[model samples]
Structures are given as C-alpha cells and as structure tokens.
Target chain A: VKLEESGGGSVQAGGSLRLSCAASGYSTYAMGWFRQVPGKEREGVARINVGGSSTWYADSVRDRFTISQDNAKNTVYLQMNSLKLEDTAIYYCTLHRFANTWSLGTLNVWGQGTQVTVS
Target chain B: QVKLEESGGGSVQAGGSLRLSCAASGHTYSTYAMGWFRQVPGKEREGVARINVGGSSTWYADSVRDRFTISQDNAKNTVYLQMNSLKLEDTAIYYCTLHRFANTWSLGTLNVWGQGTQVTVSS
Candidate 1:
C-alpha cells in the first residue's frame, strides 16, 4: 500500500494550512500524521481511526491541528491554524497496518511527505 | 521526560548478524511498547518492528519479518532489535521509539525517540 500527500506551500508565520493524504490499496483502519523539523526527531501530530471514526491528537499539536478522515474518498486531512516558524517541517501521512489485532496495528506505510515552509 | 538511548550500531559484514539496543530511562520499562524505525539515507522512515514491553506481543513489518527479531529485557529496562544476515540495503539510521500510554496502546503516539544509530552493512 502507498500514501500520497497533497497541498503544501510556503505560509506566513501566523497563517494556516491544510494537508491531505490519499491512500491507495486496501482501505485502512487507522492513519497517522507526523512532522520532523530539520535535524530533529519526528513527532506525532495526530491519528485518525477510520473504523471508529475517531481522532486523537498528540498534546504537542492538539491545540493547533484538527485531524479527520473521509472513508468515502480514502483520504485523511490535517489542518493546522496559528502556525509558526517552528511549525515548518516535512509532514508525513502514514497507514497503520494491522498486526495481531486492529488495536495493535503498526505504522507500516508512509507518504513521501509534504514540505511545509512557514516563512 | 522519557529518554531512550540506542547503541550497538556500526559496521556489520554481509551474512553476519547484529544486535541493536535501546535503554530506557525515566519510566517503567514494562509499561509501554517499544518501536523500531529506520531511515535509509535520503529516504523516509520505515517501521522495522514493535514489541509490547511485557514481551507478550510483537509486530514486524513484512519486509523485515524474515530477518528481524524484537525482544526486551525488562529487568535491565532495555529493548533489543536483532537483525540477521545483514545486507547493503540494511544500512540506515535506526531509531528506537516509545509511546506515552500503556493502556491506550492504539491511541498512543510515538512521542519519544532515541537519538538514533547509524548501521552500515559492508562486504
């Protein structure tokens, strides 16, 4: 399975941006969004559970990001508001494949990533 | 305040085996699951495997399932990823990660990561 991300560009330091990820292959039960700043470790931003239609956000981005999924389109989205220079990073969308159980799935597929620059 | 320290990454010969280690601090080792991720130079990070701290369950990416093993030594607060029959393609920076919630395994994010270790497979 593969993931393709869309919509990334330079945004003003205080502007907002929305990113989309389209999944190809089998439908996914869960998807995750992550971002990596230059020379820093990746951080999880949010997760969407398609099966449950529920979303979870990491404390780091809970206040800034809104995550959701569209089962009909097999797409997931991440909308971030009140962005800052610190938010400039490569954001990735990932597919969480089932392991022993759906609840114990692992992030197996990752999108090439969208480079979002906050100037 | 969780921190993971990774070691045992270096040059390894093809057809040989190598063991990478992740030592945890500031948290109970048996409470959370540990995940292994690797990024090939200039490439995206890929999941290698993940093992629950209790050592009762594990998940491995199909691509590496045949050659990868995940184990933990709870007493020592360390998790280990054993890779067998190293290949040139195995060269990458490996990171050990941890989620925050033990009870909410599925919802928890890999919020903490090790500094990462570079493993190069040579002929």
Candidate 2:
C-alpha cells in the first residue's frame, strides 16, 4: 500500500496544523494514527474512519484534535488545534489490517509520517 | 489508569535466544489483545507478533515466524515474546501495546503501551 503524508511541517504554539495521509495500492477502511515525541515510543492518538464514520480517539486528543477522512479520495486528515510544544512530534498514519478475531488489526504499513513542530 | 511495562533487555550474543516480558495492570489484561512491535534504529517500527489477553491465540510476521513466539499468562497478567536464533539485525527497541476496540471490533486503537525494551544482539 502507498501512504503519502504532509502539511504539518511546522506551526506556532497555540496555532493549528493539518496533516494528511493519502493511501493507495490498498483499500482499507480501518485506519489508526500514532504520535511519537523525540526519543520516545509511539503513542496512540486516535482511530479513524475514512469517509465511512466519525473518528474515535484517545481522551488526550478529545478537546484539541480532530481526524477527518475522505473515502472517495482515500485520504485521512489529522487536524490539531491549540497546538503546544508538547504536541510537537512525529505523527504516523497507518492501515489497521492484520489477523485478529477482534476489531483490532495489526499495523502492517505506515505513511512516511508528518513532522509537527510547535515553534 | 492502565499501564504496561517491558522487561528483559540487555544485549545477547548473535544466534542466541531472547525472552522478554510485558507486565500489565489496571484492568483485565487477559481479555484484551497484546501487540508486539519492534523498531530498528533509524527505521520505521514493524509488527512482530500479537497474542490474545486470555493467553491463547497468536500471530506473527512471515519474516520472524520461525524464530518468534508469543505467550501470555492470565494469572500473571503478563505477555511474553521469545525469539530464537537472534542475529545482529535483531537488535532493536521492542514495544508492547494493548489494543482497544470500539463497539463493532473492526480495528480500533492501541489503548495502553509499554515504554519499550531496547535489546541489542552482539556477538
């Protein structure tokens, strides 16, 4: 699968940023997003629906983040509001497709990732 | 306040075996799915394998299928990852994560995650 991400190059603290994930080669409606700060493990940010349903995310992003998808275009967007230095990190978008009886799928592939810098 | 912790890291000889453990608490860890992932330095993280919270059912990547095994003990509230025939390329940071699903159970999210264990394979 192909995943292209961008638009979160940099943003001012307290400002907003939009990071996009454009996927191709594979068609999966199940999507998940993760974030990693410098020298840290990736953290779960949210679960998204691409043009299919509303997003369900971690409480950490409850008030400041939004995940939007365009199923027709095969794209998912992560929008961050009131950005803070704490939110500065590498954000990765991936397809949640794997072997599991439950709804949870493995993360087989990832987008190139978008660097979100709160300057 | 759920939490996960990984243990058993500290270098191993090439061609050896490594056993790592993830201890969890705050809820029924056995009822959830424990996912294992590894990241080679400067590269993207990759899925290694996963096990059900009940200590049953497991899956792995084709590359590591012959060398890796995942097991869990519900009574201990722990998940284990054991890899054999370690190679220099096996050196990496490993992470343990708990999967969280929505009402439908398609593919939800990673609810709890361990800080990770950095294992280095050196001969």
Candidate 3:
C-alpha cells in the first residue's frame, strides 16, 4: 500500500494526503486505519469495505476522514487534510473480519506504518 | 473517558498458563469492547482477542483462539485474558485496549513496558 503525502509527497496538515492499503494473496474483508501516538496504544480511526462504504468512529477522528477505493489496483486509500497536532501519530493499515474463519482479525499483518508529524 | 490497565504475574513457568487483566476505568463498562494485545520479546504487537461487556461475542486471532479466552464483568469494569498450555515463548508484556465510541485509542505504546512480566519455562 502507498501511504503518500499530496503534491510532491510532503506530509503536512491541510495538504491533501493519501494512505493506500493494498491487498493480495488474501481477499479484503474489512480495512481499517489506526493511529498510535508517541506514547499511546493503537487507536482506530476509520474502517471501510471493498465497495468503498465506510464508517468513522467518533471521539478519535474528524469528519474530514474519508476512505476510497482503486479496484483496478486492488487497493484502498485513506485521505485526510486540515491536520492538527493531535493528528501526529503512526498510522497502520489493517485487515479484519469475524473470528475462527480466517477472518484476519485486528491486523495480524500490518504495514510498516506511516509516520505523520504535524509541524 | 475510557481507560485500560493490565496486571498479571510477572513470571510464569515455560509450559504453564498465563493470566492477565485489563481493568477499565472512567466509563460505563457496557458501552465498549475490550481487547488484548501482546508484543513478544522483540516483535511488534498482535491482537489476542476482543470481548464485549456482556460476554455476548468475541473475536479471536487464528494463532491464539484455542488458547485464549476473554471474559468481563460489567459491574467491575474489568476484562481478563487467560491463555493456557503456555510455552517459554509466551513470555512478554500484554496490554489491554478499549474500543470506545468507535475509535480504538490505546492506553499507551508498549515501550519499556512494565519492567516486563517474565514467564520462564525451564527443564
């Protein structure tokens, strides 16, 4: 997955951004994005499906959060802008479903995690 | 506010069971889901399981499903993780997380974690 910053790939708040989560070797069930600040555990931000439908959990993220799809590439993207200090955290891409059925719960396989710093 | 704290025996036998607790504070217990995580000696964090307040449903990881069981008491706002048939490799610091208001904020990153709960298996 390509988690890239917008316009020359500079990670800055309010500067269009894209976090792409690609899937292969496994069918995508539920894709989620989590944030872990410097001294905190992993926190969920948003979740999406193959059809691009999504749900954002409040108390952690803002309405500006959005998840989209690029079926041709078998990838999903998380886009957010108008950043803030609290937005600075390590972002992780995860795949999950129900349990006991190869559901891939809670991100067994995580990306290297994108580090976003709001300066 | 939602919060989670982990406590357990600092040490255990190599082939014994490991028990840990993730106590919740500052919120109604039934309002959210509780999750357990483990970070091996030198590995990244992995999800163990998640349970609801009423013990209605659970989600487990493939590697740990048969060995892990999650339970909770709404009145006490506490969730527990019990792993059986443990191995020497099970020695690691475990964490508890809360799924509150849809956002999963961790209590803290696992670093220098708890002086570590060492469970050593010996011959």
Candidate 4:
C-alpha cells in the first residue's frame, strides 16, 4: 500500500490546515494517522474508517484534530484547527496488514509524511 | 499506570545474533497482546513482531522475517526479540507496546510503550 498527501504548505497559529491522503491497494478501514515531532517518537492522530463512518482519535488529539474520509475519491482527510507552532511536524498516513502466519495482529506500514510547518 | 522497559545489548557485531528484552509491569501481562516495534533514526517505525498474551502465536513483518524472532515468558512478564545476521540498517531504537483487543484480536490499540532501546549493529 502507498500513501501521500495532497500538498505541502505552511499555516499560522489560529489557522487550519486541510490535508488529504491518497491511498491505494488497501482498505481504508485499516488506515491510521500519526504525527512525528523532531527528535521524538510518532504520536497517534486518528483513524478513518470506510464510508466516512466513525472516527477514532487518539486520546490526546481528539479535540483539535478531526478525521474524515472520501471513499469515492479513495482518500482520507485530516483537518487540524487552532494550529500552533508546537504542531510543526511531519504527518503520516499509515496502513496495517494482517492474517499472517507468525503473528495474529496488524503491522504498521507507513507512508512518506507530509511536513506541516506552523509559523 | 502500565509501565514497560526495554533492555538489551548496547551493540552487536554484524552478522551476529542478539536478543533484546522488554519488562512489563503494572498488570498481569498474560491478558493483552505484546507488540515489538523498531525505528531507524529520523524515520517512521516498523512493527517487527507481536505475540498474544497466551504466548501461543506470533507475527512478523516481511522485511525482518528472515532475521528476526520473538519469544515471551509469561511467568517473568517479559518479551524478547532476537535477530540474527544483523546488518548496518538493523541499528535502531527498538520499542515495545501493549495492545488491547476488543471483539477480535486484529482490531486492537497500542498505547503503553516502552523506553526504546538503542541498538547498534556494527563491526
């Protein structure tokens, strides 16, 4: 599976950034979002399911980050409102594949992130 | 709060075998899925292995399947990741996480994580 964002740009605090993820060869129900800060581990954002149904956000990001999907266009959307400089980071759209022989769980396959610069 | 700690060799010679461990505390570990993940510097993470609480089955990613193996000791509440014939790219910080399942095993969430272990694969 492959994932990429719509575009790259900068946003100022009190502003909002709308990013879309174009994914192919996998189910949207298994896709998740993550954010990586410089010199830190990646943080979970939210997950978008099929049909633009329920969204499961990480405990920390549920307030400011919203997740939605556009299955007709084969894409997932992430909208961050009330941005801050602290939000400057690389955001990734991740996918997981399962039902392997060895383990009975999902493996995180990541996409090249979209850098969101908060000015 | 659930606490997990990772510990292993500081460095391992290339083409050698090394075993790293994660110590889990707080609750009975036999009730959740134990996940092992690794991250190369400045890169996204890769989930290498995961074993159920009962320690009956396990899974690994394709890239690490040939060289990586994971085992758990329920009595000790620890999980181990052993890799063989390491390469320069194998040098990375390894992490551990606890996954809780809802209705099914595959549908789970990873929250509690371990302090990553810095592993260096060098000559």
> Each prediction's TM-score against the native?
0.48, 0.47, 0.44, 0.47
- Regions of candidate 1 where Cα sits further than 4 Å from its true position: A1-119, B101-110
Predictions' DockQ, in order: 0.03, 0.02, 0.03, 0.02
Off by over 4 Å in 3: A1-119, B101-123
Question: Which lDDT tens digits does candidate 1 get at residues A12-61?
Answer: 98789887766655554777677878899877777887655667787777
Residue B80 in candidate 2, Cα distance off native in Å:
0.8
Q: What is the TM-score of chain A alone in each candidate?
A: 0.86, 0.83, 0.72, 0.80
Q: Residues A1-119, candidate 3, lDDT per residue (tens digit)?
A: 32211111235666556665555443445665677787887777766665445454435566776777665555666776777778887776665552222133354445434456676
Q: How well does chain B match by TM-score in each candidate?
A: 0.86, 0.85, 0.75, 0.84
lDDT string for model 4 (A42-72, tens) is 8777776655366677666678988777787
Candidate 2 chain B minimal-lDDT segment of 10 residues? B101-110
Query: Which of the predicted structures, 2 or 3, would earn the higher DockQ when compared with the native?
Result: 3
Query: Residue B81 deviation, candidate 2, in Å?
Result: 1.0
lDDT of 2 by residue, B18-113 (tens): 898998877663366675778898887766666656534344544675477777787777888888999888899988877643111112134566
Candidate 3 lDDT, tens digit per residue, B10-97? 5656557767776766755445666666677789775555655654345444466456677777778777778887777666566666
- Candidate 4 lDDT at B35 equals 59
Please list all clashing residue pairs in model 3, or write none if there are none.
A14-A82, A40-B108, A40-B109, A41-B108, A43-B104, A44-B104, B12-B119, B14-B121
Weakest ten-residue segment in model 1 chain B by summed lDDT: B101-110
